[PDB]
Amino acid sequence: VRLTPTMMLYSGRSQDGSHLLKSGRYLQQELPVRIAHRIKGFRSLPFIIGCNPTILHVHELYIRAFQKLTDFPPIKDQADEAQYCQLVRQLLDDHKDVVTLLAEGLRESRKHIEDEKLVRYFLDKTLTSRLGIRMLATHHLALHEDKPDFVGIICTRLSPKKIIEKWVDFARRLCEHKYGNAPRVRINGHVAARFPFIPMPLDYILPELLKNAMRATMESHLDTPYNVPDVVITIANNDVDLIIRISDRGGGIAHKDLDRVMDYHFTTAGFGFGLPTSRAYAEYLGGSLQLQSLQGIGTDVYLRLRHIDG
Amino acid sequence: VRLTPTMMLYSGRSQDGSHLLKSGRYLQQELPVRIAHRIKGFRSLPFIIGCNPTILHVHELYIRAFQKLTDFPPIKDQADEAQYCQLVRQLLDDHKDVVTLLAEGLRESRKHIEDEKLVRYFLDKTLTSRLGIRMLATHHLALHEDKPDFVGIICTRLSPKKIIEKWVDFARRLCEHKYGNAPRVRINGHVAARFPFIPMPLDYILPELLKNAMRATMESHLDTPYNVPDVVITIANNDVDLIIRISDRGGGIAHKDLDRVMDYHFTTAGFGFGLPTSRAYAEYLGGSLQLQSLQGIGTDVYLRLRHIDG
Numbered sequence: 001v002r003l004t005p006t007m008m009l010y011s012g013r014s015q016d017g018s019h020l021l022k023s024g025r026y027l028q029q030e031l032p033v034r035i036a037h038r039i040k041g042f043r044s045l046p047f048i049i050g051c052n053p054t055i056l057h058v059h060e061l062y063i064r065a066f067q068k069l070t071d072f073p074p075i076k077d078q079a080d081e082a083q084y085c086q087l088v089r090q091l092l093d094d095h096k097d098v099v100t101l102l103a104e105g106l107r108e109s110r111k112h113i114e115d116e117k118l119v120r121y122f123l124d125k126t127l128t129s130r131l132g133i134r135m136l137a138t139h140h141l142a143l144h145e146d147k148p149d150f151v152g153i154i155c156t157r158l159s160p161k162k163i164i165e166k167w168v169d170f171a172r173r174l175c176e177h178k179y180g181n182a183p184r185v186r187i188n189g190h191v192a193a194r195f196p197f198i199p200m201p202l203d204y205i206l207p208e209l210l211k212n213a214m215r216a217t218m219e220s221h222l223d224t225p226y227n228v229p230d231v232v233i234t235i236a237n238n239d240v241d242l243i244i245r246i247s248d249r250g251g252g253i254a255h256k257d258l259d260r261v262m263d264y265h266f267t268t269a270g271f272g273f274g275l276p277t278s279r280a281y282a283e284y285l286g287g288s289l290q291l292q293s294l295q296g297i298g299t300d301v302y303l304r305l306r307h308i309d310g
Numbered sequence: 311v312r313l314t315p316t317m318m319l320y321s322g323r324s325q326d327g328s329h330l331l332k333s334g335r336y337l338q339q340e341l342p343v344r345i346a347h348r349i350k351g352f353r354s355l356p357f358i359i360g361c362n363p364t365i366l367h368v369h370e371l372y373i374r375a376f377q378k379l380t381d382f383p384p385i386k387d388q389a390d391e392a393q394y395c396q397l398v399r400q401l402l403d404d405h406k407d408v409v410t411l412l413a414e415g416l417r418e419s420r421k422h423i424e425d426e427k428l429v430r431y432f433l434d435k436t437l438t439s440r441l442g443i444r445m446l447a448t449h450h451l452a453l454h455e456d457k458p459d460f461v462g463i464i465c466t467r468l469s470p471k472k473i474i475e476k477w478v479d480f481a482r483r484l485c486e487h488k489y490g491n492a493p494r495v496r497i498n499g500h501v502a503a504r505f506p507f508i509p510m511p512l513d514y515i516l517p518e519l520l521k522n523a524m525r526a527t528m529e530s531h532l533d534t535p536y537n538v539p540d541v542v543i544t545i546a547n548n549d550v551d552l553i554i555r556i557s558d559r560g561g562g563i564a565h566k567d568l569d570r571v572m573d574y575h576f577t578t579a580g581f582g583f584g585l586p587t588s589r590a591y592a593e594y595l596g597g598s599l600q601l602q603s604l605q606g607i608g609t610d611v612y613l614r615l616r617h618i619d620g
């Protein structure tokens with residue numbers, strides 16, 4: 001029953017399966033209201049942006065979802081609950097490319113307005129609400145599964161080192177595929193820590209930060225691709241939060257780019273969403289994402305995520 | 311002729327010694343106005359604080375200095391200039407303990423007022439103005455000296471690694487004297503950098519940050535004083551600024567203390583002035599001082615100082 005902001009992840013264990021029903025009914029009351037807020041967000045977008053065909057498509061997707069959700073009959077039994085899950089699974093899949101569609105839709109249209117704070121706010125609000133909604137929805141679905149060491153999407157004994165290693169292997173492959181090599185990653189600090197935690201946000205954030213650090217490292221070592229400085233990751237685990245520091249020797253973020261890197265769409269090269277999205281996600285969950293640039297040397301990125309209150 | 315804020319450090323080279331006169335005359339016009347501002351600062355202190363006998367003593371010192379400075383006759387020749395230097399040297403020495411007197415005077419008296427922003431502002435403004443004044447004054451005196459690789463107090467080829475090493479040896483001695491041992495310090499990054507720079511601010515700041523990192527390291531390793539994690543210092547030198555990162559494995563700054571550590575007087579133990587003073591000095595010179603705490607692991611402190619414009 002651990003909560004994200006104004007949102008609650010049910011921990012329940014009833015052999016009869018009545019927690020599924022209480023969970024299902026909660027989801028059913030909650031999803032339409034939150035989808036309505038997203039729709040209100042689209043309605044208030046500057047006209048010229050809202051008229052972009054890709055933005056209109058996403059706008060329609062949300063209306064469609066609101067329609068199907070409200071059309072679904074109140075849940076009275078396992079049979080209803082079971083069918084609601086099919087709808088939720090369908091919606092989750094239908095909406096899996098939303099971040100990318102928004103990025104495309106907004107890329108050009110955003111420069112047609114005078115106030116630039118506007119799109120930042122819309123995206124921060126839309127993407128984090130969406131993260132919140134997908135977490136709740138996926139958590140409900142997960143309550144059906146019998147994975148050990150999970151209560152829904154909540155890992156009961158998450159190892160930060162393990163999940164970091166997972167995304168390191170992933171980022172290294174992408175990097176090897178593009179450059180013929182990848183920095184090695186060293187992990188230090190509280191490497192043996194284990195605690196209850198929701199992987200989902202880490203699954204978004206970590207690969208974004210690792211891809212950044214690896215790209216920077218390779219692009220600054222073009223003469224010695226076979227011998228590049230390691231990326232060093234430090235884990236700090238205390239009673240308040242989990243801190244993951246990702247340090248590279250990739251030459252740093254230039255002074256002229258520093259005020260831009262947190263802007264959606266800004267890139268010196270994906271589509272420039274990695275940093276602002278990651279920060280918005282971390283702040284939404286009560287944490288933060290901070291950068292320290294050592295121009296000429298490299299960058300330290302500090303991810304902080306609050307622990308699950310007990 | 312490199313400048314600090316609203317203040318100018320004369321680079322001059324006249325064999326006849328006329329730059330000494332132009333410098334002297336500049337100092338003579340500039341010191342009284344700036345001392346007057348400091349006096350105005352004392353006049354506007356909350357009554358109950360201004361009545362503290364130590365605060366009153368410092369207040370009087372500044373009046374006395376204004377008196378002697380204004381009483382000094384306009385400078386028309388080397389003889390006048392030469393005598394002005396004696397006065398400046400006397401004043402510099404008379405005022406050498408001002409930071410410490412202010413700290414004592416304010417320690418108790420400050421809690422007697424409702425607005426806490428007040429003392430922070432007074433101290434930030436008083437201490438940085440004082441740094442500015444001492445730099446100009448000392449720079450003038452230094453123009454008389456014939457040290458090679460100096461133009462006044464400006465080192466023409468400052469090595470960050472060398473000046474860091476100087477203060478490392480110093481901090482290690484203090485630390486060894488108190489704990490029987492001291493962390494080793496490793497220095498990496500742009501270790502061979504050399505550039506024109508004014509040592510004075512580094513001479514204040516570095517020992518403060520080194521003492522902090524060493525204390526934290528020892529106090530968190532009481533069982534293994536003979537084997538403690540190194541302090542690691544990274545130098546980054548680029549065209550805009552010099553960055554010095556000081557990282558320790560001293561266990562970090564606790565969440566409950568984090569909002570306090572930049573307050574004058576706050577200490578978990580000198581007199582709690584190291585951090586706020588160092589930050590005020592760095593910002594005054596166009597740089598910054600930022601902390602990243604990894605609670606349970608350690609702390610990274612980032613000092614940034616702008617280069618001398620050319």
Ligand SMILES: Nc1ncnc2c1ncn2[C@@H]1O[C@H](COP(=O)(O)OP(=O)(O)O)[C@@H](O)[C@H]1O
Binds near residue numbers: 248271
């Ligand atoms: N670790 C890093 N080192 C150097 N530059 C970085 C680092 N992380 C981000 N940046 C800079 O910030 C920009 C924004 O990154 P991001 O938001 O992830 O979008 P993208 O990776 O698509 O460019 C990058 O294009 C890059 O110039």
Ligand SMILES: Nc1ncnc2c1ncn2[C@@H]1O[C@H](COP(=O)(O)OP(=O)(O)O)[C@@H](O)[C@H]1O
Binds near residue numbers: 518560571582583608
């Ligand atoms: N590197 C560090 N590691 C852990 N704690 C630190 C560090 N630097 C500063 N602190 C904390 O911040 C407080 C304020 O430090 P400072 O302003 O230098 O005053 P003082 O050193 O006199 O306490 C210290 O008492 C200490 O608790």
Ligand SMILES: CC(C)C[C@H](Cl)C(=O)O
Binds near residue numbers: 035133
């Ligand atoms: C209707 C929901 C499940 C869709 C979420 Cl808000 C998303 O865009 O992925």
Ligand SMILES: CC(C)C[C@H](Cl)C(=O)O
Binds near residue numbers: 375405406408439443
């Ligand atoms: C009169 C000057 C030289 C004194 C400076 Cl402002 C200081 O307090 O040290």
Ligand SMILES: [K+]
Binds near residue numbers: 260275
């Ligand atoms: K970006």
Ligand SMILES: [K+]
Binds near residue numbers: 576
């Ligand atoms: K302090």
Ligand SMILES: [Mg+2]
Binds near residue numbers: 208212273274
């Ligand atoms: Mg990226």
Ligand SMILES: [Mg+2]
Binds near residue numbers: 583
């Ligand atoms: Mg100190």
